[PDB]
Write a protein that binds this ligand. Structure first.
Ligand SMILES: C[N+](C)(C)CCCC(=O)O
Ligand SMILES: C[N+](C)(C)CCCC(=O)O
Ligand SMILES: O=C(O)CNC(=O)C(=O)O
Ligand SMILES: O=C(O)CNC(=O)C(=O)O
Ligand SMILES: [Zn+2]
Ligand SMILES: [Zn+2]
Ligand SMILES: [Zn+2]
Ligand SMILES: [Zn+2]
Lengths: 386, 386
């Protein structure tokens, strides 16, 4: 391509930059120290690992290019200490330091596209066995999970072991104190409100951990007619609405560290404590995670007395917005359904149902880490586009 | 105790606060909304789970106490809607909203005590089998790990499976793409610079993950005489020195997102990308994690061209400080040694050694999550103090 073909390469600015003029007349700049740091030769770079061997200690941060020649596809550089490097035009083009080039590459790496939703949600749905068997379907599954925050998979069995298959399709599941997988049913001496017939208001799972599960998988084995409907909301959409409608409540919830706790016995004995801001912003002010489960919020609340009541007032505004008919999407799982969802972004809940002498309702759940999921998504995209 | 015995309890400030006068004449204040939110009765609180059943939707954020009576050990409160609550004096005392009381409780929950060190480090050392067998020893192990950032365990076997035993003693290990455990030895077509005979400069493990491993365990099975010494530094101590000596370099490294990558095949096939600030600060400006492995830092660098060279200049200052003779502690692992260390705080490295026709050097490593470790520490403290 004219865009990836070198018309001219030159050392500039005390030889501390290389400038490429592409055949399309666009220009790109590459710092000499970055080129040296990223020399792909066998001394500097371990090809079997696609990893840098060069040490920081080896890198002269004031380095300039000693000499440069080029052809249409490569640049060949000598360094002051006689080290010698070759860089490929396409590799350079991809890594161009312009804002537009860097942003393009970041989109390709991290799939940021996000579709916010409320009660109008058309629940994305795919077949379970299709997703296990076919990369095209597994790609649609994970890409949709990332973009929309939820996908329903239909046609699974009505037996345990289905979420474990999805785990393997991803890579591996995320072990917690509740096990590799866990059974959501009414239990005697329940160690968690989940394991009762009570209503679960909107929550994220596991804010008692400093790194809550990124992705949740929930498979319906048995459903009851007496209640137990599912509800979901898009936390990122709700947070946007809250910031606009009640900036005071938004500021409180995005700045106040709330203590979470979980003590008991399951996979092993545990005594877990964390602190999170309910609305967790990145350094640019964008909401990246919601951390909220009313069951596991501690009785311990580590704020001055005068900030307590305003916190609760803020929290109520947030919960009320989540409950609003424009925000929430309600549905009922049937046996063989699996929902797979972003546990950092969505909040989820369930309606109460009636206890009985045997088990009338049984879900199997598991977690996965977003890095594990994104890894699989990157691989699938390449396989499906190749 | 006079300190935990109630002399007077009273509703104040439109009945929106409860004030306790203790028998020691100290006074404590408890917001009415917090008391209501934390009612311990069976409607509001699931005792088997030690979790809140009360929903935010149930909580009137403007609530005041309707009536209150007390004795030396308890307060008995009626609410406007006729709900009724009992709170224990000791439970109240622990949760007092004063800065001193809250800070005390936070220290008890999170064990913040930290002892910084340099080359003068006296490496804490305990016996392996003692730590497996005895809670007193396992408590010393984890408390020291937290405070100092490293403990050496001696007298393990020279066979794989030792770190897995420590994993079970903690609770469970943290699975990654390199496996439940992994073998540090020279490998053909190595998928990681670790699996070669090369020098590893100071690094943290796994900044390619958004949640790097909190704790690392490394067991020496076979050691070589040709090199392979270990080196460690206290990253929190180095960061303090860097901030003082070079505040510009500190600001760059604590604000610049660096891209990390890992692509290959091990436990399964993986294509991993992350972004981290090398020096990661909490919201109060305290360093909480270092994220740095020069091998896995990407060729992709997502900053404007003019910020590139100053970044490298900053990075070199940081690495030079880590290498300084006052900062680093050097030692050589023998067969049967295990080091267990804080992978968020320490950086570690190894000297190069000579390749040969069979394996002359073999470590087995594994990871654990700090929340898993802290859970065990809390439990052990209670067992050993009880
Ligand atoms: C379903 N379960 C018990 C694994 C987790 C529930 C939520 C959390 O406890 O924060
Ligand atoms: C030892 N190993 C391969 C599990 C991890 C090394 C470090 C990292 O790759 O960041
Ligand atoms: O039971 C349901 O439908 C949903 N369960 C949960 O959200 C849980 O166990 O945390
Ligand atoms: O081999 C050693 O002594 C240390 N190894 C590592 O730090 C690693 O594999 O990341
Ligand atoms: Zn080179
Ligand atoms: Zn849940
Ligand atoms: Zn109550
Ligand atoms: Zn390492």
């Amino acid at each position: 391509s004219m865009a990836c073909t070198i018309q001219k390469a030159e050392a500039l600015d005390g030889a501390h930059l290389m400038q490429i003029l592409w055949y399309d007349e666009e220009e790109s700049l590459y710092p000499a120290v970055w080129l040296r740091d990223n020399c792909p030769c066998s001394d500097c770079y371990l090809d079997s690992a696609k990893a840098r061997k060069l040490l920081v200690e080896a890198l002269d941060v004031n380095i300039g290019i000693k000499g440069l020649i080029f052809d249409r596809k490569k640049v060949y550089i000598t360094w002051p200490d006689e080290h010698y490097s070759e860089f490929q035009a396409d590799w350079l083009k991809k890594r161009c330091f312009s804002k537009q080039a860097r942003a393009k590459l970041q989109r390709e790496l991290f799939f940021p596209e996000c579709q916010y939703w409320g009660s109008e949600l058309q629940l994305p749905t795919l077949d379970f066995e299709d997703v296990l068997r076919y990369d095209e379907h597994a790609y649609k599954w994970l890409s949709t999970l990332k973009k929309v925050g939820i996908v329903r998979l239909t046609g699974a069995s009505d037996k345990p072991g289905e979420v474990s298959k999805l785990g393997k399709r991803m890579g591996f599941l995320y072990l917690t104190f509740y096990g590799h997988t866990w059974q959501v049913q009414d239990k005697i001496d329940a160690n968690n409100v989940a394991y009762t017939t009570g209503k679960l208001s909107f929550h994220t799972d596991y804010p008692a951990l400093h790194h809550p599960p990124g992705v949740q998988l929930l498979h319906c084995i048995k459903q009851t007619v007496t209640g137990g409907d599912s509800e979901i909301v898009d936390g990122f959409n709700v947070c946007q609405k809250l910031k606009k409608n009640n900036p005071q409540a938004f500021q409180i919830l995005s700045s106040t560290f709330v203590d979470f706790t979980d003590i008991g016995v399951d996979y092993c004995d545990f005594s877990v404590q964390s602190k999170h801001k309910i609305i967790e912003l990145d350094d640019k002010g964008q909401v990246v995670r919601i951390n909220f489960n009313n069951a596991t919020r501690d009785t311990i609340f580590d704020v001055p007395v005068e900030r307590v009541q305003p916190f609760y007032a803020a929290l109520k505004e947030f919960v009320d917005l989540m409950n609003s008919k424009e925000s929430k999407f309600t549905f009922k799982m049937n046996p063989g359904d699996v929902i797979t969802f972003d546990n950092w972004r969505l909040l989820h809940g369930r309606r109460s149902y009636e206890a009985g002498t045997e088990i009338s309702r049984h879900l199997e759940g598991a977690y996965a880490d977003w890095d594990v999921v994104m890894s699989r998504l990157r691989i699938l995209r390449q396989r499906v586009e190749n």
